[model samples]
Target chain A: EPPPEPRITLKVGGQPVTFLVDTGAQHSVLTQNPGPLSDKSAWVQGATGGKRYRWTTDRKVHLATGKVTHSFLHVPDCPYPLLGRDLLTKLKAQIHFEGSGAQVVGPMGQPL
Target chain B: EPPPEPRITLKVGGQPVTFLVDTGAQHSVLTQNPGPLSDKSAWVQGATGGKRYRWTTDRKVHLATGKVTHSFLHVPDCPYPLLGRDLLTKLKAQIHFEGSGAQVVGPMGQPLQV
Candidate 1:
């Protein structure tokens, strides 16, 4: 049997964005410029001094129907931009690792 | 063309622990318990006050043969614990990202030979 394919849903600037769930990442990110929302003004920092850049507008992200508004942060230093654990925990997403990849689900087994 | 298969080598308890390089993680972590080195007493805090638990002894981690002693940090709550960019940058390793996956190399491009 093949491993499970990993997938995730994100909203950049109020529009739905999909991602390949990666537990290795500490924060959420976008690889390509997500259009107009890519401006630097959307960046924000965490209480612990962790920084992230905005890839989309300040908007709510829906994971399996559970929604939470997130401000974006950018890390130009990283190799591949990604969606990290910060938002994953907030949405209470569940991760299932298999041979293929991983399957991430939102609250109540809803696909994000 | 098939994407590159991502791979990374890390040291746990003075030994090597290779992993699939993931740039998204905030810090380096271990997924399965790496035996005796998995104790929580080995943790330390970053200069910025971020918390991390130690996974191996205060020793060096060799990336593609470039060696840098890394103090391990643990986060039990995380899934598929990983090695983050914190140590990656310190070692000055190069990350090659392609469709297959990714390749992480040390300063001179030597494979981590344990």
Candidate 2:
């Protein structure tokens, strides 16, 4: 069987969630309202077209090794909450691909 | 200025090309036809919607440390050619991010094969 897609489980706004690690994407996205959001919306251009997306209010994101404040785009129609480069860069993430699965290492180190 | 996007320079069909390494993407995509292509096409779904994409004919993709036969989707409007998970998985790639830039390691370590 094929290995599972690269993903990570973490807590956003104190709610446990899983996100697809998407290095190509510039911004992170959430499928539902985790908490408060910005009044203003921004236009996000994707492969298909552009759509308006609102910003999540800065909230605590709990990782396996560390914690930080982050905001995500509220895209209700998105199938998965994407963990984009914006956050990855901040965490200094390293993604190691193995035959069995993928591993994610952050600034502190890999999560046990 | 912000660091350049994670990318790599490699040879596709004997021509030098640069690709943005996109772990999120399932299929690799080339902005233009690199060489020959398949008669068949497929629908690719993105955040905005879905679009039809054609596949490239299998060709030798020369990486810094290694080479392999691979195919890519031809998507004209796409700004940058993307290196997707399909190739990354085959390479057992490890992407390391640092303050200055990013590094890529393949089966043989890195570029400068020895």
Candidate 3:
């Protein structure tokens, strides 16, 4: 089996969710609507062109290492809910890869 | 303007090339076919689903902090040429995000130290 991706399990609206730490993504994303919608919206572009959408999730996201007010783009049919740079930067993410495996930690060198 | 993404300039086929260090991508991707095609190929998936194709580029990829044999999947119209986990793992990438900006380094905490 291949090694696991750098992922973290955190609580959103008191429910646990796993996110793939993706530096490629500029903003965090959700496959489905987490909660209420916001008037704020953005246009996300990719190889297939892109799409526009507003933000969601009235639920607070709880991290293991630090606190951050989360903003997630609701992208239907998204393969994975990505933990993008928006949140990762706020949390001061430190990703270490061992080739065979990997781990995510905080700036203080603590596990996140 | 927003802060710059974590990108590094390195040599590919003896030409300087910059890549976005994208941990989300499983394999490295090339938007344009660089050189010749290889027998190997992979299916890449995204929000729009995915596609399959053989590998390309006989160019050698050179890194600043380490050495690695690269395998780039040819994906037409890819927005960015991504330095994915397949190569990031071998490079022992350490990505540090400072909110406004970020930097990448090797395992020993080198680079930007000069």
* lDDT of each residue in B1-110, candidate 3, tens digit only: 22247776667766655677888888877766456789887776765456676787466777655555676777765777778888787778788885557788877787
**Per-residue error at B50 for model 3, in Å?**
1.9
**Worst-scoring 10-residue span by lDDT in model 1 chain B:** B42-51
Model 3 chain B weakest lDDT span, ten residues long: B1-10
lDDT per residue as tens, model 1, B1-114: 211234555555666665544444445665456444645553333212344454554655665436676654544443343555556545554443322333444656543321
List pairs with backbone clashes in candidate 2. none
lDDT of 3 by residue, A7-91 (tens): 8877877686788888888888877656788888888765445668778845578875545567688877577778888888778
DockQ head-to-head 1 vs 3, winner: 3
CA error at residue A84 for candidate 2, angstroms: 1.0
Interface RMSD of candidate number 1: 13.1
Instruction: Give TM-score values for chain A, per-prediction.
Output: 0.59, 0.83, 0.84
Interface RMSD of 3: 1.8
Lowest lDDT 10-mer window, candidate 2 chain A?
Answer: A1-10
Give the Å shift of residue B90 in candidate 2: 1.4
Q: What is the lDDT of residue B84 in candidate 1?
A: 57
Ranking by TM-score: 2, 3, 1
